[PDB]
Design a protein around this ligand. Structure first.
Ligand SMILES: C/C=C/C(=O)SCCNC(=O)CCNC(=O)[C@@H](O)C(C)(C)COP(=O)(O)OP(=O)(O)OC[C@H]1O[C@@H](n2cnc3c(N)ncnc32)[C@H](O)[C@@H]1OP(=O)(O)O
Ligand SMILES: CCCCCCCCCCCC(=O)SCCNC(=O)CCNC(=O)[C@H](O)C(C)(C)COP(=O)(O)O
Ligand SMILES: [Zn+2]
Lengths: 37, 443, 253, 312, 84, 193, 85, 83, 228, 157
């Protein structure tokens, strides 16, 4: 629900945004310990 | 030469750019690699196939450094200069720009070298660059860099006494006089075989590549896959056959059997791989072995077929690496069992995965198909048993290819969404080039 | 109630002292020792001319101290990690002792960025941490690495800041978990950004400058007038030390 | 009279400026140096002029603004500073007859980079640290003895407010002001501590022995009694004075008085003395070598790097 | 903890065994120097001397004053870092 | 820094001018090469690492000696002395890896060519044994040279500032010795002979 | 002697000044007098190297011919030449 | 993910302490003895250089094989009271 | 921007020539044996240029000697920056119009790597010690002391910012609003007398800044008197 | 996430009784996740109480020689004797300790303090003279007042 952009572009990093910012790491999997071993 | 020096100085200006203006940093770093692509285009427009077998000759006095152009070197230069901007498009640090600029300079200089000592000096000047590239602190493996650097140094150290011995024997290091003097073909031949069997992945001494090409990032992965193995094939074609033919002949059964067993074991080993990147790593071994056998066959058109296959792999395999890199970066893992339902999740990306998988599998409407047809024509004319051995195991590579593709693509949708504009643009040159060379490569 | 004179200085006592109201041009030094406590800065350090640094302060790597910032390590030792950003008019302080019982030195880890108007005093700042504006960490509190502190946030003494999280408020409280990308690059991104700005400023450093000419001209005028005075600080210091020794020895028995 | 008070050349004794030259060698060297200076200045100005608009700004010294005047106004009562006659140039040029400068106790110490102007009284042993601002321009500023103004704090008054009551700011004796604190139109009683980074608004008054928490926000016109600790934004009462905290404030008074004395000692040194100290440090490091040839003949003083007696 | 709780105990018993003012069977693994043995401060000092002599250490006077029991000596030795 | 350059230079010159013998030194060359390589691989201490590196280099020089052809001996001695001069006056650690790559025989810099003509002259007499031994020891050098590179290249950049004046009192000689990448241009021709 | 020796020396002096400013934390372009002096030094030094090559080659041909190893005049030009290669 | 160190911590540290409660002597003596041996008997290999290569390589392999490493060198004789 | 490149090369050449001239004058002072050049005097600069990029200051504007500006700073007619304040435009342009006060040791600048250009209107009062980063503000707004305005937020013309509050990034506040708190929020509307006090605010700052400029000019006269 | 108490240093406070080679007890406060020797330096121990690590790519790491009582033996993180790191540790035993070895001899660089380490008591182990390079050596005499914490840097070079 965050706002990482302005109404006119201008990507905002949103360092101090309460919501979790969508990023490159957004679609990372949750590793399975047995699989990792 | 003057133009080349201008590019050399112009590329170095990256470090002189203050880091404050990142936009211009990216622009300059990309344009520096853009320029040589147009320069090689201008060269190709300048070449004459009705002229001498070598054109654009230049020598830097008594400093060795003999530079001349054949079709093989020009085509390899074109393919490399196409590859490099994509690699630049995948980097974010000035250090990476500098390293890849130096690597590209070294590759281009070696690609048209005509001095065996010159090739020796210029080729392995990038070994430290690869060492720094592969074993990066946060994500790389030091062991892979250690491996590859030791293998390359071992090869070069084996070769060097042979190089200096033939130098003293003939008083020079130019190929066009090395090819014209009587020499002890055997020792130099062993040196050349050792180096170019280390460089091109050939069993048994080939084990550095599976770790190296996987530990490296996407740009270095594409570089290593599409360039440094072809340095071996152009090495054969430019040096070994023109200089020492008798050694080439007396070793032909050994080279052939080694290539065959390499192809067979690599093909069988690939199915047991559990990571996509390792699967792509083993894939190139069979192609390189096929190239080497085609070169050593010398039956009807061996050099041209080998060049065609080298171009085909340097076109297709980097696309596999691009897809692998996109999936890893937007997934943070390379482990197969975390890939599923990719077609519904990444429609265009999965379609590209399919197309380039078929490209790896030598199917019609692709340059790889004509490449392997010509290579098998050359092999068959020498003998039919080797051609049958290559023909019989065609199913075994496509086996792992289709298995991995279907396993990761179909099934339960889970993972990243489809590709971005930058990723599609990176994919684009390989698709267009493969289509163009698989429809009307010649005219 | 302490006399402004020090006979036991590492360099000897000052013979002539000058009143501040008698100063007609400012002589503010950016970096200067404190008795036997001396600074330690990298060769490529950016120190803004209006910054304040003194005494036993440690600075590592591509760190930076910006305009009007203060690092007063008079009561303890101060350490600054590699490539750490200190923006304009911030203070890094310390005390003689803390209730926690640890070293009262204020520790700043590498790749830690600080916005303007921050007060740091007797706190351990682990590497890769963002410090907001109008934000303070009290004595004995510890901020774990890979953390971001919101501006206008108060960190009480002897408190803890668990890592991998975003915290803020007055008093500070949990807000949200830092994303893995934020831990991976963003902290280093800010570090490199402000280091690039600091080096940009350092590039055009015309040091020591030319403003000394006018002061030199005024002194030269005094020389022409002869009113400029010669004083051997070494021998006058020796005489003052001998006077101190004599007067001290003449008061025990 | 260390060992060679009468033999050492003046150049060693006065490294900041050599005396008048005597010999032809010295005079010719001085002339060559003057020519070098002139040519270098000409080259510098040529480079600046070809550089363009950016070079138009030069290296000019900053005024000593820690003691700077403000305007003597009719309505404004001078009760903290003191009116003084303006320099004759100011009067003859731009009509300035009376100026008011701070009334500063000689024992007090102010950093060389602060901004203190006009109607300010500083208590005996009171301190103003680096980077702070104390602009007494429209009202008075009263600071008690042994009272500290820490770094980057702001002290300002109001001649006109929302309610239009010109209220001066008064600070008692033994009072602590935090780093980067905010002071505006408030009264602070004796032996009080103000947190670092806090913010005090107008009409507020603090009783003696009270605590201002760091970073807190003071509402306009609010009174906080003694023996209380307040925090929040705006602040709320939280806790009473623990027995040890008043003694902690006293310890702060003592230790920061010592700090102010030491910093005054460090700051009140002349340039030539600082260069002498630098040369002394240089020679001392040259003497840090145990294998220095002098160490079997000449014994040097630690503080002055001069021979006191021979070793053998 | 710097030494074993048993070997130290048997060594202590053995060094106690060779005192003329003590009863060889009255010595127990845990006892009291005053109530059980009826030994004064000087005898306790002599005890401390013998124990330190066997164990090759040094004990300041205050620690010896704190020592008044066999278990005290055993735990003191086991708490000594110079133990051998 | 003194020891690595001067007495060795003078002894090589006196050997070249007024020395002949009717024997070999090959077994000692094997001792020096193998022992220096293994020790420099195995010693974590930087001082002993460079010590065993020096042992391996002096073994290489002895190998050059045994097959005559003192021109390569001279040039390699000069290159190694240049490197040692660059070594012991280092204040920044970024250039420290350049010494390793100028010692590990990496192509673009002078150590490679200095070892290269030595190998050329060794093959000029077909000294197969010692040439192969030198090649293997050259390979073994690369391990600890890469280790050096890791230790002082892939690290945060930090250089202490001078306090007693003398501000980086050896910049000039350092940066001058750095300009060895430009040497191979003049070196590749028959220069030293 | 080589044609571009002095240019190589000037480039070496350029990098020399660059890395001198590197070793002191300064911008690469600061203190240009060092750059000029280093360029002059490199130019003269590599000119000396180019001349020394010719000196050594003349020494080589002289020594070889004096020993009795007489050459056909065609290859003597490979040694008896101040070529501006 | 992290692999586990095999074995027990206590046992492995005790093995780390095996044959190390001993003072290190001076390296001077070994150095003097090596120099003396070289000065005294190295001339025995003077006739060696003419020998057939097969025998010389056999000798090299033997000499490499029988070598004992000075670092981490320990004997049972270091902690026994009698022969 | 080839004009930028030409300006940059001219600046670099002039900068190197300044280096050479000042170094040679240092050498000449060494020959004359007087080391006044060695003095570690403060180099704090009111006007600090960024290569070719220079602050533009109205002839009716004013900056304190402790006040500083860097980069392409635009201060409008009768616009004041008070003592010790730091407005930075080295990386991003900051534009300020007429009759605006930047009070003592208050911060307005854009130094976040993605902070856009900063816009300041007219009759704008930034309180003592307030921090403004990457934000735009309309006319006639009281910016409170020690307050924080974050990036790309729009302060519409006519609102109120209470002292010491924190404004979140991209959080636009409409006109005529009183806002407070670190998670700042609307409190109430502006009152008539409060707005009148705000409207009377600018002229007092203008007259005081002119007076301060006069006193500073007197002090500079005395500084010259020392050497002139 | 609810009324969970605010994070304070008390919850991670670790205390260890350390006795010098002169037999003087000293109270030291430690923190979870950090090495014992780092806190030892943080306490004010003399530089003679420390030594460089004798391993590869770890020579910037300091350590002190201590004795671990019997109970806490299992809290020491395991190290392979066959490993290269184990070889470095064995070189440390071989050189630094010599005949100062005791079955409780251990290295603080491998002690990661935790909850269980609260109340643990250790003392300093004696060492032989040593030299690493020009700027950091040990005479064999513990007569000094310089704090190891006062060294600006750890120069392996
Ligand atoms: C350089 C010169 C330095 C000096 O000499 S003094 C100048 C600088 N000194 C200061 O930092 C003064 C302020 N220090 C203090 O924190 C103190 O005085 C502060 C005393 C009231 C309290 O600090 P304490 O360490 O005594 O903390 P408390 O036990 O009183 O905390 C109680 C309560 O108040 C809250 N609290 C505590 N301190 C603060 C603060 N600061 N702000 C907001 N809220 C706070 C806190 O949330 C606590 O509740 P929880 O954490 O929810 O359980
Ligand atoms: C080579 C040796 C040379 C020796 C020369 C020096 C000889 C000094 C001998 C004289 C020293 C003294 O008596 S010192 C005088 C000691 N007397 C007192 O202090 C008064 C109270 N009596 C005690 O304290 C007794 O020791 C006791 C009742 C046992 C208390 O029982 P404990 O002990 O349980 O405590
Ligand atoms: Zn005000």
């Amino acid at each position: 629900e965050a706002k990482q952009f302005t109404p006119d572009g201008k990507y905002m990093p949103g360092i101090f945004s309460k919501a979790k910012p969508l990023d490159r790491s957004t679609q990372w999997v949750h590793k399975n310990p047995y699989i990792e071993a | 030469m003057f133009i080349s020096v201008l590019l050399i100085l112009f590329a170095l200006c990256v470090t002189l750019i203050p880091e404050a203006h990142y936009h211009m940093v990216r622009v300059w770093s990309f344009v520096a690699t853009i320029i040589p692509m147009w320069v090689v285009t201008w060269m190709w427009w300048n070449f004459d196939a009705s002229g001498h077998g070598l054109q654009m000759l230049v020598i830097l006095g008594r400093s060795h450094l003999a530079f001349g152009i054949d079709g093989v070197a020009l085509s390899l230069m074109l393919l490399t200069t196409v590859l490099f901007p994509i690699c630049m498009m995948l980097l974010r640090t000035v250090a990476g720009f500098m390293t890849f600029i130096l690597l590209e300079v070294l590759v281009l200089s070696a690609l048209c070298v005509l001095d065996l000592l010159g090739f020796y000096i210029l080729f392995e000047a990038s070994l430290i660059l690869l060492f720094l590239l592969i074993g990066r602190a946060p994500y790389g493996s030091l062991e892979a860099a250690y491996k590859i650097v030791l293998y390359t140094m071992a090869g070069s150290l084996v070769l060097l006494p042979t190089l200096f011995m033939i130098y003293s024997e003939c008083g020079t290091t130019n190929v066009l006089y090395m090819t014209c003097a009587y020499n002890h073909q055997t020792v130099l031949g062993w040196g050349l075989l050792a180096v170019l069997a280390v460089k091109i992945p050939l069993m048994p001494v080939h084990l550095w590549l599976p770790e190296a090409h996987v530990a490296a990032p996407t740009a270095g992965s594409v570089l290593l896959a599409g360039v440094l193995l072809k340095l071996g094939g152009i090495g054969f074609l430019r040096f070994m056959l023109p200089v020492v033919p008798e050694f080439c002949v007396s070793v032909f059964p050994l080279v052939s059997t080694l290539c065959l067993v390499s192809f067979l074991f690599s093909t069988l080993s690939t199915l047991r791989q559990i990571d996509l990147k390792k699967i792509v790593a083993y894939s190139s071994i069979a192609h390189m072995s096929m190239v080497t056998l085609a070169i050593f066959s010398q039956s009807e058109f061996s050099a041209y077929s080998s060049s065609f296959l080298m171009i085909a792999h340097g076109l297709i395999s980097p696309a596999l690496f691009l897809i692998v890199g996109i999936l890893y970066d937007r997934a943070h893992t390379k482990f197969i069992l975390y890939f599923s339902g990719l077609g519904a999740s990444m429609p265009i990306g999965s379609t590209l995965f399919f197309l380039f998988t078929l490209g790896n599998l030598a199917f019609p409407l692709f340059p790889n198909f004509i490449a392997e047809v010509l290579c098998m024509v050359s092999i068959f004319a020498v003998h039919e048993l080797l051609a049958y051995v290559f023909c019989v195991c065609q199913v075994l590579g496509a086996a792992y290819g289709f298995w991995a593709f279907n396993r990761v693509v179909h099934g339960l949708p889970r993972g990243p969404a489809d590709v971005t504009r930058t990723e599609f643009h990176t994919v684009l040159p390989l698709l267009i080039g493969a289509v163009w060379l698989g429809i009307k490569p010649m005219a | 109630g302490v006399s402004s004179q020090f006979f036991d200085a590492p360099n000897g006592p000052s013979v002539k002292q000058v009143l501040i109201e008698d100063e007609w041009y400012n002589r503010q030094r950016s970096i200067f020792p404190l008795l036997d406590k001396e600074p330690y800065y990298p060769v490529d350090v950016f120190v803004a001319p209006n910054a304040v640094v003194c005494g036993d302060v440690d600075i590592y790597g591509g760190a930076s101290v910006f305009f009007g910032a203060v690092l007063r390590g008079d009561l303890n030792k101060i350490r600054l990690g590699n490539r750490s950003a200190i923006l304009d008019r911030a203070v890094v302080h310390a005390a003689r002792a803390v209730p926690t019982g640890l070293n009262a030195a204020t520790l700043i880890g590498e790749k830690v960025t600080v916005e303007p108007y921050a007060v740091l005093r007797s706190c351990r700042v682990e590497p890769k941490v963002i410090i907001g504006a109008r934000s303070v960490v009290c004595e004995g509190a510890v901020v774990e690495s890979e953390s971001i502190l919101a501006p206008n946030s108060v960190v009480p003494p002897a408190r803890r800041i668990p890592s991998g999280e975003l915290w803020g408020g007055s008093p500070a409280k949990f807000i949200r978990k830092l994303t893995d990308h934020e831990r991976d690059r963003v902290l280093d991104d800010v570090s490199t950004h402000y280091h690039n700005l600091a080096t940009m400023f350092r590039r055009e450093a015309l040091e020591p400058g030319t403003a000394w000419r006018d002061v030199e001209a005024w002194r030269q005028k005094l020389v022409d007038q002869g009113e400029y005075e010669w004083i051997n600080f070494r021998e006058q210091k020796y005489l003052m030390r001998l006077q101190h020794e004599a007067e001290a020895l003449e008061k025990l028995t | 009279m260390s060992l060679f008070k009468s033999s050492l050349p003046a150049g060693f004794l006065f490294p900041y400026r050599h005396p008048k030259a005597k010999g032809l060698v010295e005079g010719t060297l001085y002339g060559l140096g003057s020519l070098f200076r002139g040519v270098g200045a000409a080259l510098d100005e040529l480079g600046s002029m070809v550089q363009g608009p950016q070079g138009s700004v030069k290296d000019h010294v900053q005024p000593n603004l820690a003691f700077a005047p403000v305007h003597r106004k009719p309505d404004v009562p001078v009760n903290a500073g003191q009116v003084v006659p303006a320099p004759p140039a100011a009067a003859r040029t731009l009509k300035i007859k009376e100026v008011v400068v701070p009334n500063k106790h000689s024992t007090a110490f102010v950093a060389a980079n602060a901004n203190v102007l006009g109607n300010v009284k500083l208590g005996a042993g009171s301190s103003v640290w680096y980077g702070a601002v104390l602009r007494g321009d429209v009202n008075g500023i009263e600071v008690g003895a042994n009272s500290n103004i820490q770094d980057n704090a702001i002290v300002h008054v109001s001649k006109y407010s929302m309610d239009g009551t010109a209220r001066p700011t008064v600070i008692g004796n033994n009072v602590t002001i935090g780093h980067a604190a905010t002071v505006h139109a408030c009264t602070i009683e004796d032996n009080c501590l103000v947190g670092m980074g806090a913010t005090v608004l107008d009409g507020a008054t603090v009783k003696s022995g009270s605590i201002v928490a760091a970073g807190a926000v003071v509402p306009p016109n609010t009174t906080i009694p003694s023996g209380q600790v307040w925090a929040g934004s705006p602040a709320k009462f939280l806790r009473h004075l623990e027995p040890e905290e008043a003694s902690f404030i006293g310890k702060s008074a003592s230790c920061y008085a010592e700090l102010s004395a030491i910093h005054k000692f460090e700051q009140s040194k002349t340039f030539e003395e600082q260069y002498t100290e630098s040369c002394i440090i240089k020679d001392r490091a040259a003497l840090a070598d145990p294998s220095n040839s002098v160490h079997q003949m000449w014994e040097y003083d630690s503080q002055t790097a001069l021979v006191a007696r021979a070793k053998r | 903890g710097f030494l074993d709780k048993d070997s130290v105990t048997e060594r202590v018993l053995h060094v106690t065994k060779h005192f003329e003012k003590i009863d060889a069977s009255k010595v127990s693994p845990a006892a009291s120097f005053e109530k059980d043995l009826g030994l004064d401060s000087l005898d306790v000092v002599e005890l401390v001397m013998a124990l330190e002599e066997e164990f090759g250490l040094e004990i300041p006077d205050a620690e010896a004053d704190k020592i008044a029991s066999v278990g005290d000596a055993i735990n003191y030795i086991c708490s000594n870092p110079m133990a051998k | 820094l003194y020891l690595s350059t001067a007495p060795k230079l003078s002894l090589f010159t006196f050997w070249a001018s007024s020395w002949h013998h009717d024997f070999s030194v090959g077994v000692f060359i094997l001792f020096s090469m193998f022992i220096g390589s293994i020790g420099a691989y195995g010693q974590p201490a930087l001082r002993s690492l460079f010590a065993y590196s020096t042992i391996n280099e002096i073994g290489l020089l002895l190998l050059a000696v045994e097959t005559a052809g003192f021109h390569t001996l001279y040039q390699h001695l000069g290159i190694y002395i240049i490197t040692q001069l660059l070594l012991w006056n280092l204040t920044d650690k970024r250039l420290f890896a350049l010494c390793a790559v100028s010692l590990a025989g990496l192509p673009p810099f002078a150590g490679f060519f200095g070892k290269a003509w030595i190998f050329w002259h060794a093959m000029s007499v077909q000294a197969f044994s010692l040439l192969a031994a030198a090649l293997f020891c050259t390979l073994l050098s690369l391990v600890y040279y890469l280790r050096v590179i890791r230790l002082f290249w892939t690290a945060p950049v930090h250089t202490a500032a001078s306090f007693t004046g003398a501000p980086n009192q050896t910049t000039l000689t350092s940066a001058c010795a750095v300009a060895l990448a430009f040497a191979p241009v003049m070196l590749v021709k028959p220069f030293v002979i | 002697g080589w044609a571009y020796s002095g240019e190589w020396g000037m480039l070496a002096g350029f990098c020399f000044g660059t890395l001198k400013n590197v070793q002191e934390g300064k911008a690469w372009f600061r203190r240009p007098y060092i750059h000029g002096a280093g360029m002059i030094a490199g130019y003269y030094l590599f000119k000396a190297a180019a001349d020394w090559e010719d000196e050594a080659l003349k020494r080589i041909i002289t020594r070889y011919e004096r020993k009795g190893y007489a050459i056909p005049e065609d290859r003597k030009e490979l040694f008896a030449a101040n070529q501006y290669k | 993910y992290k692999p586990e160190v095999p074995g027990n911590t206590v046992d492995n540290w005790t093995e780390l302490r095996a044959s190390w409660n001993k003072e290190r002597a001076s390296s001077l003596g070994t150095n003097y003895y090596l120099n003396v041996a070289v000065m005294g008997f190295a001339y025995w290999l003077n006739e060696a250089y003419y020998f057939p290569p097969r025998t010389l390589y056999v000798g090299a392999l033997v000499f490499f094989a029988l070598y004992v490493r000075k670092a981490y060198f320990s004997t049972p004789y270091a902690f026994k009271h009698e022969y | 921007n080839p004009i930028n490149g030409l300006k940059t090369i001219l600046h670099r050449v002039g900068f190197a020539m300044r280096e050479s001239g000042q170094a040679l004058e240092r050498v000449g002072c060494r020959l004359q044996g007087v080391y006044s050049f060695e003095e570690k005097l403060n180099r704090h600069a009111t006007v600090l240029p960024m290569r070719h990029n220079v602050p533009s200051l109205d002839k009716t504007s004013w900056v304190a000697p402790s006040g500083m500006v860097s980069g392409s700073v635009t201060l409008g007619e009768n616009s004041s920056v008070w003592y010790g304040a730091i407005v930075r435009g080295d990386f991003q342009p900051v534009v300020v119009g007429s009759n605006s006060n930047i009070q003592d040791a208050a911060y307005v600048g854009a130094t976040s790597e993605f902070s856009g250009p900063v816009t300041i209107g007219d009759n704008v009062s930034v309180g003592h010690g307030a921090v403004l980063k990457g934000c735009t503000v309309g006319d006639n707004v009281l910016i409170g002391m020690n307050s924080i305005i974050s990036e790309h937020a729009e302060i519409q013309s006519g609102a109120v910012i209470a002292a010491g509050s924190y404004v979140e990034e991209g959080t636009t506040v409409p006109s005529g609003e009183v806002w407070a708190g670190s998670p700042a929020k609307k409190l109430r509307d502006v009152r008539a007398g409060e707005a009148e006090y705000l409207k009377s605010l600018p002229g007092r700052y203008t007259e005081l800044a002119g007076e301060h400029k006069g006193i500073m000019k007197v002090l500079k006269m005395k500084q010259a008197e020392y050497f002139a | 996430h609810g009324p969970a108490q605010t994070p304070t240093v008390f919850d991670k406070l670790v205390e260890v009784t350390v006795v010098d080679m002169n037999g003087i007890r000293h109270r030291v406060r430690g923190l979870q996740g950090q090495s014992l020797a780092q806190a030892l330096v943080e306490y004010g121990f003399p530089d003679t109480y420390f030594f460089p690590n004798m391993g590869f790519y770890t020579q910037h790491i300091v350590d002190a020689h201590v004795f671990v009582p019997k109970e806490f033996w299992g809290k020491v993180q395991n190290v392979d004797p066959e490993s290269d790191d184990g070889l470095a540790v064995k070189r440390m035993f071989r050189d630094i300790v010599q005949d100062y070895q005791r079955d409780t001899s251990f290295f603080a660089s491998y002690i990661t303090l935790g909850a269980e380490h609260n109340g643990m008591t250790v003392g300093i182990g004696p060492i032989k003279p040593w030299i690493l390079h020009s700027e950091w050596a040990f005479a064999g005499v513990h007569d000094s007042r310089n704090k190891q914490f006062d060294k600006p840097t750890v120069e392996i070079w």
